[PDB]
Design a protein around this motif. Structure first.
Motif, PDB file in Angstrom:
ATOM      1  N   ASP A  62      -7.007   2.343   4.172  1.00 37.12           N
ATOM      2  CA  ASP A  62      -6.653   1.108   4.427  1.00 37.12           C
ATOM      3  C   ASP A  62      -7.700  -0.160   3.979  1.00 37.12           C
ATOM      4  O   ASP A  62      -7.349  -0.965   3.358  1.00 37.12           O
ATOM      5  N   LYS A  65      -7.676  -0.476   0.469  1.00 31.51           N
ATOM      6  CA  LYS A  65      -6.606  -1.339  -0.094  1.00 31.51           C
ATOM      7  C   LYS A  65      -6.871  -2.658   0.232  1.00 31.51           C
ATOM      8  O   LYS A  65      -6.482  -3.609  -0.533  1.00 31.51           O
ATOM      9  N   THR A  71      -3.706   2.034  -3.524  1.00 35.29           N
ATOM     10  CA  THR A  71      -2.351   1.936  -3.136  1.00 35.29           C
ATOM     11  C   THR A  71      -2.104   2.432  -1.553  1.00 35.29           C
ATOM     12  O   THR A  71      -3.059   3.214  -0.841  1.00 35.29           O
ATOM     13  N   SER A  72      -0.886   2.541  -0.993  1.00 33.43           N
ATOM     14  CA  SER A  72      -0.666   2.954  -0.030  1.00 33.43           C
ATOM     15  C   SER A  72      -0.227   4.488   0.089  1.00 33.43           C
ATOM     16  O   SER A  72       0.176   4.803  -1.268  1.00 33.43           O
ATOM     17  N   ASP A  74       2.243   7.423  -0.429  1.00 35.35           N
ATOM     18  CA  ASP A  74       3.581   7.471  -0.837  1.00 35.35           C
ATOM     19  C   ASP A  74       4.539   8.873  -0.272  1.00 35.35           C
ATOM     20  O   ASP A  74       3.898   9.515   0.588  1.00 35.35           O
ATOM     21  N   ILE A  79      -1.580   9.204  -3.609  1.00 35.32           N
ATOM     22  CA  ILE A  79      -2.133   7.754  -3.693  1.00 35.32           C
ATOM     23  C   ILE A  79      -2.223   7.349  -5.062  1.00 35.32           C
ATOM     24  O   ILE A  79      -2.807   8.231  -5.825  1.00 35.32           O
TER      25      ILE A  79
END
Length: 109
Positions: A62, A65, A71-72, A74, A79
């Motif tokens: 996080d 990010k 990225t978050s 998935d 990621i």
DNA sequence: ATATATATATATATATATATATATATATATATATATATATATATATATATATATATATAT
């Protein structure tokens, strides 16, 4: 902080390898959480459980990010590494820190 | 000559993350309280068998 530096170093190295195998900018870099957690344990120590490792990794992911570096997670627990890492400021300092770490993981035990 | 201005050092504030303690809130298991079926007690009508007794037969 230290842990964040380790995570950027790891993802930088893996992105570089990805560009070696795929060419530069041809395909987005991806990695699985299960492939990162072992190295975080290797280089930082066991927090107490797999759950705590995952919580720490999620907090760090996080944070990155926030900087636009990852990225978050998935559906595959995977990621994507944001290509912005290719323009980081001082990658050589990251390499120096990684060398210091692989020396400490040996000396400490 | 006096005062100007930049580079320097240091004291303070600001940003950010980690962990802990917090407040609001949900749900849980717990206890008080009410409702009930049930049994037992209080009172009663109707009447019997009884003890006490009047009224009374009988006696000296």
């Amino acid at each position: 902080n230290l842990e964040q530096s380790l995570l950027v170093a790891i993802l930088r190295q893996h992105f570089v390898a990805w560009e070696q195998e795929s060419g530069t900018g041809a395909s987005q870099a991806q990695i699985a959480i299960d492939d990162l957690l072992p190295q975080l344990q290797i280089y930082l120590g066991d927090p107490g459980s797999e759950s705590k490792e995952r919580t720490r990794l999620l907090t760090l992911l996080d944070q990155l990010k926030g900087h636009g570096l990852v990225t978050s997670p998935d559906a595959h627990e995977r990621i994507v590494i944001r290509p912005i890492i290719a323009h980081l400021a001082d990658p050589i300092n990251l390499q120096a820190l990684l060398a210091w770490l692989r020396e400490q993981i040996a000396q400490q035990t």
